[PDB]
Nucleic acid binder design. Structure first.
Ligand SMILES: [Cl-]
Ligand SMILES: [Cl-]
Ligand SMILES: [Cl-]
Ligand SMILES: [Cl-]
Ligand SMILES: [K+]
Ligand SMILES: [Mg+2]
Ligand SMILES: [Mg+2]
Ligand SMILES: [Mg+2]
Ligand SMILES: [Mg+2]
Ligand SMILES: [Mg+2]
Ligand SMILES: [Mg+2]
Ligand SMILES: [Mg+2]
Ligand SMILES: [Mg+2]
Ligand SMILES: [Mg+2]
Ligand SMILES: [Mg+2]
Ligand SMILES: [Mg+2]
Ligand SMILES: [Mg+2]
Ligand SMILES: [Mg+2]
Ligand SMILES: [Mg+2]
Ligand SMILES: [Mg+2]
Ligand SMILES: [Mg+2]
Ligand code: NA
Ligand code: NA
Ligand code: NA
Ligand code: NA
Ligand code: NA
Ligand code: NA
Ligand code: NA
Ligand code: NA
Ligand SMILES: [Sr+2]
Ligand SMILES: [Sr+2]
Ligand SMILES: [Sr+2]
Ligand SMILES: [Sr+2]
Ligand SMILES: [Sr+2]
Ligand SMILES: [Sr+2]
Ligand SMILES: [Sr+2]
Ligand SMILES: [Sr+2]
Ligand SMILES: [Sr+2]
Ligand SMILES: [Sr+2]
Ligand SMILES: [Sr+2]
Ligand SMILES: [Sr+2]
Ligand SMILES: [Sr+2]
Ligand SMILES: [Sr+2]
Ligand SMILES: [Sr+2]
Lengths: 56, 194, 92, 237
RNA sequence: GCUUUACUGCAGGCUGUCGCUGAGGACUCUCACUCCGGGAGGAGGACACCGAUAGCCGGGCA
RNA sequence: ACUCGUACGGUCACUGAAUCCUGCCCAGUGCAGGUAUCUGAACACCUCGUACAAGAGGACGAAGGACCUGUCAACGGCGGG
RNA sequence: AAACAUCUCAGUAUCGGGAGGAACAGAAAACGCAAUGUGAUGUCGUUAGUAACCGCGAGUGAACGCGAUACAGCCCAAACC
């Protein structure tokens, strides 16, 4: 069985869903953690300096 | 004449001799069974506390904190490093244990502000310090001429920004001349080379 | 090669020819207080220590004479260029 | 390289854990005040998944229903005793001090009151040899002479299920089933059959450890493989 | 990426020393500390654990 | 974690059902044990040096090594004349 | 650094914690143009790529002072009550 097309047919699991806190479809319903805003992981909002150029 | 306080002071110049020695041997047994941060009704070293700003008044709190002894607790490098940045065992942290203790205490009492702290001994595996914290929101303090200064907004979380006596010393701010070229006015403004 | 223990030659101090006694230069003991000693301690720590991690070099097949020439009358010694010599034995 | 299997084990991930949620109970001796006024009746014999040996469910006088490490020859209805004054017969528990020398025992405590640590496996038994007022000498199944506090409790008799090891598994499938009931990763891939990146013995045109197998006690994890601190090897000499 | 008796280091293990740590080159004790015990209490004991340092081993790792 | 586990256990390795068998080698390397003597760091101690300190030397000496022994179903070896 | 290990890149990127409108520093156990002299602290210009560091290689690199800006000095602990 190929890792490509044939293996894509098995994908019918729902993981990332609309987040209650930020509105992005990034709330992982199995982990109950938003990969975009951090909801479920931290009270503080998910942020990182690498999301932009170092001097900007 | 000598103050009664000077006697507590003098006892503590040699915590390993005299009655103080026996008191510590007894006490530490209880301390070792207490938590990380224990509020206490009265300072173990009155002379030191009053000397640091302590007052028997509403809004003044004292808490003893214990911390694990030794150097740093670091995880070895998973990614490549040159011999220099491979060090793991003998590398110590930049904040002394007293400072770590002041912060834990302040985290326990989110609403209070650290005023000062002092050592109350240690055993072979941990160190104890008592911390004086103040309630900036209590009127008994807002009206105190000697402590109301700690009520200002810029004094919030002072311990976490190194504004404590222990903080200032640890930042190499003791000396006003030679040796403080890279510490004053801040470690950061001097590129972190102090 | 053989070498006379004593002989007449020029003493740069008396400024005239006098009898000298020849001796092989014996190594003096270190004190461990020179600037280099302090730099070794100061700069050696965790990991590689640069120059202080290097170790003793090799050896030339033959070494040059390492001698002291002592004036027999003013008691002072002077040094001279050496010359490669497999062995140096003094006569008397 | 990569961490060897022995290092993966320690993380305690599912693959290496024992099916604890399936285990029945820990056969520790009962805790008695004193007097030995504790007796119960064997209400049933059960299978212990964790030891591939039988265990007995006992109902004690004071209403406590508990599984016990069963010696051989214990059946339903039989009455068991646990205490200083307990009678000296198979299935009963009492401190070594009260036990007569020359009597095979099992589920022997290491420190008085711990519940039993020694000789708990199928058909095994410790042999109480010497007595005293300060030390009870027991011969453990490995043949070692162990000095124990006479206050250490034990059960008279040998553990049930002896001979279990006398029959071969015959097929992989049988080993398989047993392994699924233990905290063990099975089957076993030889070190020499792996790539150099995976084990000290991996790599090489043909299979063979590229080094002596006897490793030092001081070797660090990841390197301590093969014959650990062997005092000797082989069969000869 | 991989190897090793390549170079240089780093974890880690063994070992001494100092602190924890007390009383009367071999010893006794109990009071810290450790372990067992539901508890009473039992076992051990200034050792062990832990902090520091020194020597040895050290492709397990860089 | 192993482990609601305790030597009829479970960890680490090699070989690879049954059957008939499995020789010789411990010098090197590895592991382990022992060790009169030798070597073997730091602290403390002693001499010199310094009104102190740096430092030089000494005495003591742990593991380790030298040395001895065990061990090949341990790495491996079993030739030329 | 024409490799590279000390060094460099750099206390940079990135991470953890925290305050404000600005932060931080701050009224000498200072300085040491050694003086019959200066007089809290930032900052700017300069002092200066100087002193100092450094496989004494590549490179790293202040301070006092001076000229400016702005200026401001006080409160406890204890003694005695
Ligand atoms: Cl605070
Ligand atoms: Cl010569
Ligand atoms: Cl099995
Ligand atoms: Cl001046
Ligand atoms: K580098
Ligand atoms: Mg600033
Ligand atoms: Mg059990
Ligand atoms: Mg399984
Ligand atoms: Mg296999
Ligand atoms: Mg393969
Ligand atoms: Mg490997
Ligand atoms: Mg093979
Ligand atoms: Mg094969
Ligand atoms: Mg416990
Ligand atoms: Mg490598
Ligand atoms: Mg095969
Ligand atoms: Mg380069
Ligand atoms: Mg160069
Ligand atoms: Mg720099
Ligand atoms: Mg200056
Ligand atoms: Mg007043
Ligand atoms: Na706080
Ligand atoms: Na240095
Ligand atoms: Na590659
Ligand atoms: Na051999
Ligand atoms: Na280059
Ligand atoms: Na290169
Ligand atoms: Na350098
Ligand atoms: Na001037
Ligand atoms: Sr397949
Ligand atoms: Sr699916
Ligand atoms: Sr969470
Ligand atoms: Sr962030
Ligand atoms: Sr806050
Ligand atoms: Sr240094
Ligand atoms: Sr070094
Ligand atoms: Sr040569
Ligand atoms: Sr148990
Ligand atoms: Sr238990
Ligand atoms: Sr191999
Ligand atoms: Sr043999
Ligand atoms: Sr066969
Ligand atoms: Sr051998
Ligand atoms: Sr002014």
């Amino acid at each position: 069985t190929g890792a490509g097309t044939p293996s894509q047919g098995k994908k019918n699991t729902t993981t990332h869903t609309k987040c209650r806190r930020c509105g992005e479809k990034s709330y992982h319903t199995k982990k109950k953690v938003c990969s975009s805003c951090g909801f479920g992981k931290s009270a503080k909002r998910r942020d990182y300096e690498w999301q932009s150029k170092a001097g900007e | 004449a000598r103050s009664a306080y000077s006697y507590i002071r003098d006892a503590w110049e040699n915590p390993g001799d005299g009655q103080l020695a026996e008191l510590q041997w007894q006490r530490q047994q209880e301390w070792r069974n207490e938590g990380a941060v224990e509020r206490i009704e009265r300072p173990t070293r009155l002379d030191k506390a009053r000397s640091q700003g302590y007052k028997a008044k509403q809004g003044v709190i004292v808490a003893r904190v214990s911390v694990r002894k030794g150097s740093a607790r670091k995880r070895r490098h998973k990614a490549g490093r040159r011999s220099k940045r491979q060090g793991v065992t003998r590398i110590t942290r930049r904040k002394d244990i007293q400072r770590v203790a002041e912060e834990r205490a302040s985290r326990t009492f989110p609403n209070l502000r650290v005023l000062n702290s002092y050592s109350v001994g240690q055993d072979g595996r941990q160190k104890w310090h008592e911390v004086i914290l103040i309630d900036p929101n209590h009127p008994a303090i807002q009206n105190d001429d000697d402590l109301s200064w700690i009520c200002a907004d810029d004094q919030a979380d002072r311990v976490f920004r190194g504004l404590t006596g222990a903080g200032r010393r640890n930042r190499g701010l003791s000396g006003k001349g030679k040796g403080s070229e890279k510490t004053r006015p801040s470690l950061r403004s001097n590129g972190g080379k102090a | 090669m053989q070498m006379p223990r004593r002989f007449n030659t020029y003493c740069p101090h008396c400024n005239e020819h006098q009898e000298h006694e020849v001796e092989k230069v014996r190594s003096g003991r270190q004190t461990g207080m020179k600037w280099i000693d302090r730099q070794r301690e100061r700069n050696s720590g965790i990991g590689n220590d640069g120059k202080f991690s290097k170790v003793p070099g090799g050896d030339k097949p033959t070494k040059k004479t390492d001698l002291k020439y002592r004036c027999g009358e003013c008691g002072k010694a002077h040094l001279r260029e050496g010359w490669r010599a497999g062995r140096l034995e003094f006569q008397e | 390289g990569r961490r060897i299997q022995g290092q993966r084990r320690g993380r305690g991930t599912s693959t290496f854990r024992a099916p604890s949620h399936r285990y029945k109970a820990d056969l520790e001796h009962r805790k008695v005040e004193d007097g030995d006024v504790i007796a119960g009746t064997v209400v049933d014999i059960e299978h212990d998944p964790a030891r591939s040996a039988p265990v007995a469910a006992v109902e004690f006088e004071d209403g406590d229903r508990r599984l016990i490490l069963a010696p051989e020859g214990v059946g339903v209805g039989d009455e068991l005793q646990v205490g200083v004054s307990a009678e000296i017969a198979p299935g009963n528990t009492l401190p070594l001090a009260e036990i007569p020398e020359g009597v095979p025992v099992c589920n022997v405590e290491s420190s008085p009151g711990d519940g039993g640590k020694f000789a708990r496996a199928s058909g095994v038994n410790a042999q109480l040899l010497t007595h005293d007022r300060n030390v009870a000498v027991v011969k453990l199944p490995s043949g070692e002479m162990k000095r124990l506090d006479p206050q250490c409790r034990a059960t008279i008799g040998v553990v049930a299920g002896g001979g279990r090891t006398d029959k071969p598994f015959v097929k992989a499938g049988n080993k398989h089933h047993k392994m699924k009931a233990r905290g063990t990763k099975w089957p076993n891939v030889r070190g020499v059959a792996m790539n150099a990146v995976d084990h000290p013995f991996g790599g090489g045109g043909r299979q063979h450890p590229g080094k002596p197998k006897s490793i030092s006690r001081n070797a660090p994890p990841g390197r301590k493989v093969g014959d650990i601190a062997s005092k000797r090897t082989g069969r000869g000499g």
